[PDB]
């Protein structure tokens, strides 16, 4: 299982922080995802930062106001929100999953080396999910 920070209430305008912790260090090879769940509006994908540390994809719709960090030493996921508007009043879930790092077009060299490779990675699944943190913004 996973642990998330407790429910939070924030006055709009300032920032909020959410922490997702794994028990000890048993989930390190798996990649990290953040999701949002506006009630009655389905679920949205906040973004992900992978597990090797080579990706930081965050959806552009939330790129400006949302940051996702990972502390290796404590093995802790950090989610920072800045705008904190009425639309952010919802439940944020931390998920641990796995991807498929396929190798697409790659330029081998004459001698047989690997000059470069786009090797774009594909999302496979999100096995482990946090208990969910409710963030309430009230004016």
């Amino acid at each position: 299982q996973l642990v998330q920070s407790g429910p939070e209430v924030r006055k709009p305008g300032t920032s909020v922080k959410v922490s997702c912790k794994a028990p000890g260090n048993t989930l390190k090879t798996y990649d990290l995802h953040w999701v949002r769940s506006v009630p009655g509006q389905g679920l949205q994908w906040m973004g992900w930062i992978s597990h090797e540390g080579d990706k930081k994809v965050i959806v552009e719709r939330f790129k400006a106001k949302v940051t996702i960090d990972w502390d290796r030493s404590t093995n802790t996921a950090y989610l920072q929100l800045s705008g904190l508007t009425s639309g952010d009043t919802a439940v944020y879930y931390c998920a641990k999953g796995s991807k498929h790092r396929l190798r697409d077009y790659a330029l081998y060299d004459d001698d047989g080396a690997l000059n470069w490779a786009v090797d774009v990675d594909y999302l496979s699944n999100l096995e482990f999910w946090g208990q969910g943190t409710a963030v309430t913004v009230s004016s």
Binding site: Y105, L107, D109, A113, N115, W116
Partner: protein, 42 residues
């Protein structure tokens, strides 16, 4: 009219001065000089 298909642009990838970074280099070639395998050629 006689150049309908007698020249090809044939843009393709290469490695720059650094063997890690990429570079999309475009060129020109004659029809008699490439073979189909848009449509890829070699």
């Amino acid at each position: 009219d006689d150049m309908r298909g007698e020249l090809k642009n044939c843009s393709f990838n290469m490695t720059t001065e650094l063997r890690d970074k990429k570079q999309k280099v475009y060129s020109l070639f004659y029809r008699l000089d490439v073979v189909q395998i848009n449509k890829e050629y070699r």
